JSON list of C-alpha atoms in Angstrom, two decimals:
[
{"chain": "A", "resi": 1, "resn": "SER", "atom": "CA", "xyz": [24.70, -25.55, -28.01]},
{"chain": "A", "resi": 2, "resn": "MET", "atom": "CA", "xyz": [27.89, -27.44, -28.98]},
{"chain": "A", "resi": 3, "resn": "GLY", "atom": "CA", "xyz": [31.60, -26.45, -28.79]},
{"chain": "A", "resi": 4, "resn": "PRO", "atom": "CA", "xyz": [34.83, -27.69, -27.09]},
{"chain": "A", "resi": 5, "resn": "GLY", "atom": "CA", "xyz": [34.47, -25.24, -24.13]},
{"chain": "A", "resi": 6, "resn": "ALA", "atom": "CA", "xyz": [31.78, -27.41, -22.52]},
{"chain": "A", "resi": 7, "resn": "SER", "atom": "CA", "xyz": [32.81, -26.37, -18.94]},
{"chain": "A", "resi": 8, "resn": "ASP", "atom": "CA", "xyz": [29.86, -25.94, -16.48]},
{"chain": "A", "resi": 9, "resn": "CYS", "atom": "CA", "xyz": [31.40, -23.23, -14.18]},
{"chain": "A", "resi": 10, "resn": "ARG", "atom": "CA", "xyz": [31.54, -19.38, -14.30]},
{"chain": "A", "resi": 11, "resn": "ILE", "atom": "CA", "xyz": [32.95, -16.45, -12.26]},
{"chain": "A", "resi": 12, "resn": "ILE", "atom": "CA", "xyz": [30.91, -13.56, -10.78]},
{"chain": "A", "resi": 13, "resn": "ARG", "atom": "CA", "xyz": [31.86, -10.23, -9.08]},
{"chain": "A", "resi": 14, "resn": "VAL", "atom": "CA", "xyz": [30.84, -9.71, -5.42]},
{"chain": "A", "resi": 15, "resn": "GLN", "atom": "CA", "xyz": [30.98, -6.41, -3.38]},
{"chain": "A", "resi": 16, "resn": "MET", "atom": "CA", "xyz": [30.68, -5.89, 0.43]},
{"chain": "A", "resi": 17, "resn": "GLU", "atom": "CA", "xyz": [29.84, -2.89, 2.70]},
{"chain": "A", "resi": 18, "resn": "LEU", "atom": "CA", "xyz": [33.56, -1.97, 2.91]},
{"chain": "A", "resi": 19, "resn": "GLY", "atom": "CA", "xyz": [33.03, 1.63, 1.60]},
{"chain": "A", "resi": 20, "resn": "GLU", "atom": "CA", "xyz": [36.59, 3.07, 2.04]},
{"chain": "A", "resi": 21, "resn": "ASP", "atom": "CA", "xyz": [38.35, -0.03, 0.55]},
{"chain": "A", "resi": 22, "resn": "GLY", "atom": "CA", "xyz": [36.10, 0.50, -2.53]},
{"chain": "A", "resi": 23, "resn": "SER", "atom": "CA", "xyz": [33.84, -1.95, -4.37]},
{"chain": "A", "resi": 24, "resn": "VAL", "atom": "CA", "xyz": [35.28, -5.40, -3.64]},
{"chain": "A", "resi": 25, "resn": "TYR", "atom": "CA", "xyz": [33.92, -7.10, -6.84]},
{"chain": "A", "resi": 26, "resn": "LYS", "atom": "CA", "xyz": [36.19, -10.14, -6.25]},
{"chain": "A", "resi": 27, "resn": "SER", "atom": "CA", "xyz": [36.16, -12.91, -8.87]},
{"chain": "A", "resi": 28, "resn": "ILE", "atom": "CA", "xyz": [34.15, -15.74, -7.17]},
{"chain": "A", "resi": 29, "resn": "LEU", "atom": "CA", "xyz": [33.80, -19.12, -8.95]},
{"chain": "A", "resi": 30, "resn": "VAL", "atom": "CA", "xyz": [30.26, -20.56, -9.27]},
{"chain": "A", "resi": 31, "resn": "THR", "atom": "CA", "xyz": [29.66, -24.29, -9.73]},
{"chain": "A", "resi": 32, "resn": "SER", "atom": "CA", "xyz": [26.44, -26.04, -10.84]},
{"chain": "A", "resi": 33, "resn": "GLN", "atom": "CA", "xyz": [25.43, -26.76, -7.19]},
{"chain": "A", "resi": 34, "resn": "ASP", "atom": "CA", "xyz": [27.08, -23.76, -5.46]},
{"chain": "A", "resi": 35, "resn": "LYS", "atom": "CA", "xyz": [24.40, -22.78, -2.90]},
{"chain": "A", "resi": 36, "resn": "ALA", "atom": "CA", "xyz": [24.20, -19.25, -1.44]},
{"chain": "A", "resi": 37, "resn": "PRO", "atom": "CA", "xyz": [25.97, -20.14, 1.89]},
{"chain": "A", "resi": 38, "resn": "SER", "atom": "CA", "xyz": [28.83, -21.89, 0.01]},
{"chain": "A", "resi": 39, "resn": "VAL", "atom": "CA", "xyz": [29.48, -18.85, -2.20]},
{"chain": "A", "resi": 40, "resn": "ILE", "atom": "CA", "xyz": [29.21, -16.53, 0.85]},
{"chain": "A", "resi": 41, "resn": "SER", "atom": "CA", "xyz": [32.05, -18.45, 2.58]},
{"chain": "A", "resi": 42, "resn": "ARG", "atom": "CA", "xyz": [34.29, -17.80, -0.46]},
{"chain": "A", "resi": 43, "resn": "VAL", "atom": "CA", "xyz": [33.38, -14.08, -0.54]},
{"chain": "A", "resi": 44, "resn": "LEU", "atom": "CA", "xyz": [34.06, -13.70, 3.20]},
{"chain": "A", "resi": 45, "resn": "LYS", "atom": "CA", "xyz": [37.57, -15.23, 2.87]},
{"chain": "A", "resi": 46, "resn": "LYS", "atom": "CA", "xyz": [38.21, -13.06, -0.22]},
{"chain": "A", "resi": 47, "resn": "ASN", "atom": "CA", "xyz": [37.58, -9.99, 1.98]},
{"chain": "A", "resi": 48, "resn": "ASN", "atom": "CA", "xyz": [40.69, -10.88, 4.11]},
{"chain": "A", "resi": 49, "resn": "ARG", "atom": "CA", "xyz": [38.32, -11.98, 6.90]},
{"chain": "A", "resi": 50, "resn": "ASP", "atom": "CA", "xyz": [38.55, -14.49, 9.78]},
{"chain": "A", "resi": 51, "resn": "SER", "atom": "CA", "xyz": [35.55, -15.60, 7.65]},
{"chain": "A", "resi": 52, "resn": "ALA", "atom": "CA", "xyz": [32.67, -16.36, 9.60]},
{"chain": "A", "resi": 53, "resn": "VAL", "atom": "CA", "xyz": [29.37, -18.19, 9.44]},
{"chain": "A", "resi": 54, "resn": "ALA", "atom": "CA", "xyz": [27.56, -17.64, 6.16]},
{"chain": "A", "resi": 55, "resn": "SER", "atom": "CA", "xyz": [24.23, -17.89, 8.10]},
{"chain": "A", "resi": 56, "resn": "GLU", "atom": "CA", "xyz": [24.97, -14.36, 9.44]},
{"chain": "A", "resi": 57, "resn": "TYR", "atom": "CA", "xyz": [24.94, -12.96, 5.87]},
{"chain": "A", "resi": 58, "resn": "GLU", "atom": "CA", "xyz": [22.79, -13.23, 2.72]},
{"chain": "A", "resi": 59, "resn": "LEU", "atom": "CA", "xyz": [23.73, -13.56, -0.96]},
{"chain": "A", "resi": 60, "resn": "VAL", "atom": "CA", "xyz": [22.34, -10.78, -3.18]},
{"chain": "A", "resi": 61, "resn": "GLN", "atom": "CA", "xyz": [22.31, -10.44, -6.99]},
{"chain": "A", "resi": 62, "resn": "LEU", "atom": "CA", "xyz": [22.42, -6.96, -8.58]},
{"chain": "A", "resi": 63, "resn": "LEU", "atom": "CA", "xyz": [19.99, -6.29, -11.44]},
{"chain": "A", "resi": 64, "resn": "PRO", "atom": "CA", "xyz": [20.58, -3.59, -14.18]},
{"chain": "A", "resi": 65, "resn": "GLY", "atom": "CA", "xyz": [17.43, -1.55, -13.23]},
{"chain": "A", "resi": 66, "resn": "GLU", "atom": "CA", "xyz": [18.91, -0.72, -9.73]},
{"chain": "A", "resi": 67, "resn": "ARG", "atom": "CA", "xyz": [17.16, -3.68, -8.01]},
{"chain": "A", "resi": 68, "resn": "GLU", "atom": "CA", "xyz": [18.36, -6.49, -5.75]},
{"chain": "A", "resi": 69, "resn": "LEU", "atom": "CA", "xyz": [17.36, -10.18, -5.97]},
{"chain": "A", "resi": 70, "resn": "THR", "atom": "CA", "xyz": [18.30, -11.91, -2.70]},
{"chain": "A", "resi": 71, "resn": "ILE", "atom": "CA", "xyz": [19.23, -15.61, -3.15]},
{"chain": "A", "resi": 72, "resn": "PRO", "atom": "CA", "xyz": [17.94, -17.97, -0.35]},
{"chain": "A", "resi": 73, "resn": "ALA", "atom": "CA", "xyz": [20.07, -20.67, 1.37]},
{"chain": "A", "resi": 74, "resn": "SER", "atom": "CA", "xyz": [18.56, -23.75, -0.38]},
{"chain": "A", "resi": 75, "resn": "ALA", "atom": "CA", "xyz": [19.01, -22.30, -3.90]},
{"chain": "A", "resi": 76, "resn": "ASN", "atom": "CA", "xyz": [21.97, -23.05, -6.23]},
{"chain": "A", "resi": 77, "resn": "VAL", "atom": "CA", "xyz": [23.17, -19.50, -7.09]},
{"chain": "A", "resi": 78, "resn": "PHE", "atom": "CA", "xyz": [24.02, -20.79, -10.61]},
{"chain": "A", "resi": 79, "resn": "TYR", "atom": "CA", "xyz": [20.22, -21.31, -11.22]},
{"chain": "A", "resi": 80, "resn": "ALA", "atom": "CA", "xyz": [18.71, -18.97, -8.59]},
{"chain": "A", "resi": 81, "resn": "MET", "atom": "CA", "xyz": [20.39, -15.88, -10.03]},
{"chain": "A", "resi": 82, "resn": "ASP", "atom": "CA", "xyz": [18.31, -14.24, -12.75]},
{"chain": "A", "resi": 83, "resn": "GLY", "atom": "CA", "xyz": [21.33, -14.40, -15.08]},
{"chain": "A", "resi": 84, "resn": "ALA", "atom": "CA", "xyz": [20.84, -10.76, -16.30]},
{"chain": "A", "resi": 85, "resn": "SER", "atom": "CA", "xyz": [24.02, -9.60, -14.49]},
{"chain": "A", "resi": 86, "resn": "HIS", "atom": "CA", "xyz": [27.10, -11.54, -13.29]},
{"chain": "A", "resi": 87, "resn": "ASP", "atom": "CA", "xyz": [27.37, -8.91, -10.48]},
{"chain": "A", "resi": 88, "resn": "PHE", "atom": "CA", "xyz": [26.46, -9.68, -6.87]},
{"chain": "A", "resi": 89, "resn": "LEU", "atom": "CA", "xyz": [26.97, -8.39, -3.32]},
{"chain": "A", "resi": 90, "resn": "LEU", "atom": "CA", "xyz": [27.05, -9.82, 0.23]},
{"chain": "A", "resi": 91, "resn": "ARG", "atom": "CA", "xyz": [25.57, -8.16, 3.39]},
{"chain": "A", "resi": 92, "resn": "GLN", "atom": "CA", "xyz": [25.25, -9.08, 7.08]},
{"chain": "A", "resi": 93, "resn": "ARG", "atom": "CA", "xyz": [21.65, -10.30, 7.71]},
{"chain": "A", "resi": 94, "resn": "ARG", "atom": "CA", "xyz": [19.79, -9.56, 10.93]},
{"chain": "A", "resi": 95, "resn": "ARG", "atom": "CA", "xyz": [17.48, -12.55, 11.51]},
{"chain": "A", "resi": 96, "resn": "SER", "atom": "CA", "xyz": [17.30, -15.06, 14.39]},
{"chain": "A", "resi": 97, "resn": "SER", "atom": "CA", "xyz": [18.61, -18.50, 15.33]},
{"chain": "A", "resi": 98, "resn": "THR", "atom": "CA", "xyz": [17.92, -22.27, 15.40]},
{"chain": "A", "resi": 99, "resn": "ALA", "atom": "CA", "xyz": [14.53, -22.12, 17.31]},
{"chain": "A", "resi": 100, "resn": "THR", "atom": "CA", "xyz": [13.31, -25.63, 16.20]}
]
């Protein structure tokens, strides 16, 4: 398409397991090459955290049929996300270390 608003970035909503504090849903910017671990770092610091290694968490996209599409590390969220919902979440991942 054509139009003056040719910008290539967008903003998504991201929750966390906070519970009491309510659904975070913070406005997180998404660039053309924003990979999962880059976006996670922004979400973590938006949660008033001492924001930690993104490798300890995983990026998740919410889908309208009550499903979850988990975005892997080497995928640009901007293209990895299905694009059916601008809503996402972040959760601590339990998976091991740097064994070669």
